[PDB]
Design a protein around this ligand. Structure first.
Ligand SMILES: COc1cc(C)c(S(=O)(=O)NC[C@@H](O)[C@H](Cc2ccccc2)NCc2cccc(Cl)c2)c(C)c1C
Ligand code: NA
Lengths: 29, 251, 10
């Protein structure tokens, strides 16, 4: 794929988390 | 999106609006997977039973958007289509098997804070994350109930066990689909709805912190009904076709 | 229903 894919400028690139991404992580048991 | 919430700014920078030229209207969602390729559902472009057969010139893609209706000056970019590619085995007659299509843009779109491609999964990311109970995220500007949103909506939904998907419907379910949504017992709700089709079902890899597009909003019977689930095109299963079209027709 | 987009795009 592309080198920078799936890394969001306003979130991952700046190390900010969106308000519900943690709901996804918590489901990956 | 039913029972979702407003997206944050820059939350889904790969989200694309499929926009009809005349009359000016939202057709579907879509996703940006490189500077010149946009992924969507075949049925957004081709559905003979309802006399839908768009050509390149019927359509625009609007990238970088948040508001549904507003022209987002200095933020969104609007792109014309060079070429449409519908999966040759898209089953519009029976069950929307292989509900996938690619659109090549006339020119590359410039990436920004609001415009950025999503990853496509490898076999291992799919094996690892496409599991019942695991949550993905669906975004779109589609209907709020089976009115319309001011801004991009977001909902997180769990992948559902395959026997449960099958038993929820009379439609024949194939290996190129998965379903997602909460059960009636589970006490949370949410679903895609009309206008959301062709948009992405994404998951954030806990391994490399990257968002992968695992599904494409494909179909449901109603929106947010109890005992029903939304059905998504299984993107990894169709990835050979994706690469074939891009290798062949990409520059 | 939608805000008119610039004419160039049409
Ligand atoms: C050809 O196979 C189908 C065709 C139609 C036309 C329908 S339907 O009953 O009309 N529902 C689909 C429709 O509501 C849309 C998708 C669509 C739109 C136009 C043409 C074809 C399909 N569903 C959007 C949606 C709602 C809730 C959840 C999700 Cl994931 C998607 C269904 C289920 C199947 C299997
Ligand atoms: Na549902």
């Amino acid at each position: 794929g592309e080198a920078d894919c799936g890394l969001r400028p306003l979130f991952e690139k700046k190390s900010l988390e969106d308000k519900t991404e943690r709901e996804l992580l918590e489901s990956y048991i | 999106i039913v029972e979702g919430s407003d997206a944050e700014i820059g939350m889904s920078p790969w989200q694309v609006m499929l926009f009809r030229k005349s009359p000016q209207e939202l057709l579907c969602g879509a996703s940006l997977i490189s500077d010149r390729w946009v992924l969507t559902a075949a049925h957004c472009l081709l559905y003979p039973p309802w006399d839908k057969n768009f050509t390149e010139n019927d359509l625009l893609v609007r990238i970088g958007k948040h508001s549904r209706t507003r022209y987002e000056r200095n933020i969104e970019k609007i792109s014309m289509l060079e070429k449409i590619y519908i999966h040759p085995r898209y089953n519009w007659r029976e069950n929307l098997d292989r509900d996938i299509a690619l659109m090549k843009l006339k020119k590359p779109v410039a990436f920004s804070d609001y415009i950025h491609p999503v990853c496509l999964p490898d076999r291992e990311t799919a094996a690892s994350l496409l599991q019942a109970g695991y949550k993905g995220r669906v975004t779109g500007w589609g209907n709020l109930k089976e009115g319309q949103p001011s801004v991009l909506q977001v909902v997180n939904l769990p992948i559902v066990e395959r026997p449960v998907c099958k038993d929820s419907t009379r439609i024949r379910i194939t290996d190129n689909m998965f379903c997602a949504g909460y059960k009636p017992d589970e006490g949370k709700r949410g679903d895609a709805c009309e206008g959301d089709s062709g948009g992405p079902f994404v998951m954030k890899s806990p391994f490399n912190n990257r968002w992968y597009q695992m599904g494409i909003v494909s179909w449901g019977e109603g929106c947010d009904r109890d005992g029903k689930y939304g059905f998504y095109t299984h993107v990894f299963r169709l990835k050979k076709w994706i690469q074939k079209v891009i290798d062949q027709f990409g520059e | 229903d939608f805000e008119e987009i610039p004419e160039e795009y049409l």
